[PDB]
């Protein structure tokens, strides 16, 4: 069984930027989610081999995880905050597509998502 290659975290053709919102996304938003007790299943790409989930990458064609997001932010991969926010939303959406309500991974995602939304409700200015 095989995992796909992970999402790219660097691209030498993609214009890079640092914005105050992107800085906040790394130093406030990602930091707070990463240290949460429910973060661990979301800190790296889903390992469908180890979890024996052979349908995971049949169902989820746009995978995303906080390890990828962390690296993208550290690399200045993004041009704007909305690109990064979309990656978080993709991560949560994928979880809700694949898994069922009341599964532990879903309860964990829901709590992380509430925290995410609380922090992005106060995005700073440039």
């Amino acid at each position: 069984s095989m995992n796909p290659p992970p999402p790219e975290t660097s691209n030498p053709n993609k214009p890079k930027r640092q914005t105050n919102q992107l800085q906040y996304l790394l130093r406030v938003v990602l930091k707070t989610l990463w240290k949460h007790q429910f973060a661990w299943p979301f800190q790296q790409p889903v390992d469908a081999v180890k979890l024996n989930l052979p349908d995971y990458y049949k169902i989820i064609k746009t995978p995303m995880d906080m390890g990828t997001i962390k690296k993208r932010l550290e690399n200045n991969y993004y041009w704007n905050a909305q690109e990064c926010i979309q990656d978080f939303n993709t991560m949560f959406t994928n979880c809700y597509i694949y898994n069922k309500p009341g599964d532990d991974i879903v309860l964990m995602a829901e709590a992380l998502e509430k925290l995410f939304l609380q922090k992005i409700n106060e995005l700073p200015t440039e």
Binding site: F38, P41, L53, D103, D104, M108
Partner: peptide, 9 residues
Amino acid sequence: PGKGVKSPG
């Protein structure tokens, strides 16, 4: 199937 039981860190 799903991912099973997950304990908090």
